[PDB]
Amino acid sequence: CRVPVARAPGVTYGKRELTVKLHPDHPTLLTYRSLGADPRPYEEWIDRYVERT
Amino acid sequence: YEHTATIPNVVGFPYKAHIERNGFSPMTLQLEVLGTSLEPTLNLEYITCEYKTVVPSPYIKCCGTSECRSMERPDYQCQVYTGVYPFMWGGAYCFCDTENTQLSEAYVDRSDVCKHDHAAAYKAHTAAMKATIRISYGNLNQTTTAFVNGEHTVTVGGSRFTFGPISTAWTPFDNKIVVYKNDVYNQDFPPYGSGQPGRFGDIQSRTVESKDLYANTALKLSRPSSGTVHVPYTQTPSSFKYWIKERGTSLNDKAPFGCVIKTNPVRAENCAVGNIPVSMDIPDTAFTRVIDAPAVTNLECQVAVCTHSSDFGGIATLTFKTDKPGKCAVHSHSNVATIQEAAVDIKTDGKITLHFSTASASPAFKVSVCSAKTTCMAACEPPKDHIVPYGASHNNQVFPDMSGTAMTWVQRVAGGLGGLTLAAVAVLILVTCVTMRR
Numbered sequence A: 001c002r003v004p005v006a007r008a009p010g011v012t013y014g015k016r017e018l019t020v021k022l023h024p025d026h027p028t029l030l031t032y033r034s035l036g037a038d039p040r041p042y043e044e045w046i047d048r049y050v051e052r053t
Numbered sequence B: 001y002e003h004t005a006t007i008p009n010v011v012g013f014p015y016k017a018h019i020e021r022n023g024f025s026p027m028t029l030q031l032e033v034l035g036t037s038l039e040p041t042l043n044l045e046y047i048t049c050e051y052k053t054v055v056p057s058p059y060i061k062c063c064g065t066s067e068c069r070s071m072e073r074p075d076y077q078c079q080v081y082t083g084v085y086p087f088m089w090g091g092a093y094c095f096c097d098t099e100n101t102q103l104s105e106a107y108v109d110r111s112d113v114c115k116h117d118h119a120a121a122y123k124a125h126t127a128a129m130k131a132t133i134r135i136s137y138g139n140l141n142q143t144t145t146a147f148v149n150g151e152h153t154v155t156v157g158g159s160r161f162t163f164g165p166i167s168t169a170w171t172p173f174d175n176k177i178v179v180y181k182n183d184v185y186n187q188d189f190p191p192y193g194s195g196q197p198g199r200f201g202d203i204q205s206r207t208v209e210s211k212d213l214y215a216n217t218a219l220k221l222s223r224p225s226s227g228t229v230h231v232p233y234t235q236t237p238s239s240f241k242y243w244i245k246e247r248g249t250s251l252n253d254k255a256p257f258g259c260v261i262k263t264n265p266v267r268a269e270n271c272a273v274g275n276i277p278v279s280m281d282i283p284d285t286a287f288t289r290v291i292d293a294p295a296v297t298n299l300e301c302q303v304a305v306c307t308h309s310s311d312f313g314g315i316a317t318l319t320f321k322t323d324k325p326g327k328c329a330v331h332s333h334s335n336v337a338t339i340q341e342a343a344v345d346i347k348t349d350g351k352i353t354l355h356f357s358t359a360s361a362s363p364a365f366k367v368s369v370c371s372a373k374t375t376c377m378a379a380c381e382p383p384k385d386h387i388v389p390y391g392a393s394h395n396n397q398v399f400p401d402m403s404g405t406a407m408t409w410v411q412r413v414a415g416g417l418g419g420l421t422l423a424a425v426a427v428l429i430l431v432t433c434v435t436m437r438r
């Protein structure tokens, strides 16, 4: 089949923190996890212009 | 010749092992892992598809009656009614007012695409880790694969290696596994013969093609209404289409140690845990005799830069008194810095350059070039970039040795009041030996 890609999100580097800026055109999915001893999964259907850390 | 070592498990991390023996030049190795799978020892408990209920055409009878059948079928249920008045399309259909029954029948089985898409349920009790280490020494680069347990043995060129057991026995799975198409789910599935309607496991067959289907989808077969010809029923919906939506994530998106989870020979490739022991069997026709090696005297190192960056952010400079050109093999006798490239080419003038990488403010590593050693000390500075796209090449060690500037002030407080404490003792020793007797 065929599926569109999302825009590349803008990032801003901080001390032990990463602020990423998001831009959807339709409901897309977000997932990150810490690849160390203990994972911390987060998942949310982003709908509008938001901004996360 | 025999030699053992242990390597950390992180992928893309060239490790150096050092070999010393009497009568030959020292020699360094370069082990570097390139991939690691982890297959559990599967056995299919069952397999799950999306069912298909087949309601055939309802058989009326216009004057007589009919009876039940009691056929053999997974969720079979048929039951007959009293007199019904069909009234099909033009006028009536049996041309009486009563005593005309309508037998109804329905059952369930597996799908028609059940051999194409399916969830597969396994059990992970043991696991056998493979690997893809490449091996570098002299003028020889090979790449071999081996089951990582302490008995399989592979050969490389003219030498032989074997890899010991994995240190821990940790699995990213658990004893339960659910494999649909590209996403193993670490969920405790309900067992065989105890399926529940609506939730995952409503239809269950032991293998891909067999008889003896198992199903309880709560098929209920109600009574037909006024004069139309239809067989009505009611049923709990397909569980497997709830589980395609109500699946939260995969296990690829909540795996513990940062490991991708492939699916077809169900795998757990590229984990990061523990360490791997090795065993060497390098024969004698790989070294150089000590006469043929270039003699090195009077080493002296002198650092230049030393930042704390995760790559090789440090350049040292060494001087020496050689006698002939050749090719040495450098090594670091500490876990504080890791010298890169391991294979310098000595020339007539006494000047070479290296590249190392630390993680603390003051190192104390010591360098051997060709059977001759010296010690290096540096004053290092922290970097500026906060988030880096690559990993970590050093070892995680933050401790100034004994003579760093941050620890020099400790000895000028320890020797100060500590030397004054014994001076307050030495007054009391004189008093408790002169005027305990006079």
Ligand SMILES: *[C@@H]1O[C@H](CO)[C@@H](O[C@@H]2O[C@H](CO)[C@@H](O[C@@H]3O[C@H](CO[C@H]4O[C@H](CO)[C@@H](O)[C@H](O)[C@@H]4O)[C@@H](O)[C@H](O[C@H]4O[C@H](CO)[C@@H](O)[C@H](O)[C@@H]4O)[C@@H]3O)[C@H](O)[C@H]2NC(C)=O)[C@H](O)[C@H]1NC(C)=O
Pocket: B138, B139, B140, B141
């Ligand atoms: C030791 O063993 C190997 C046996 O293969 C030999 O050394 C290998 O040599 C091959 C090439 O012959 C190396 O493979 C390729 O090297 C290319 C050169 O790298 C330059 O470009 C990259 C990219 O900009 C720079 O980062 C780098 O600094 C160099 O300027 C790479 O371009 C190749 O990239 C490929 O893979 C990447 C993903 O990693 C893809 O994105 C690319 O599109 C491309 O497909 C590739 O890396 C290989 O790295 C060498 N292995 C070593 C040194 O271990 C030697 O012959 C052998 N030793 C002796 C003495 O014989």
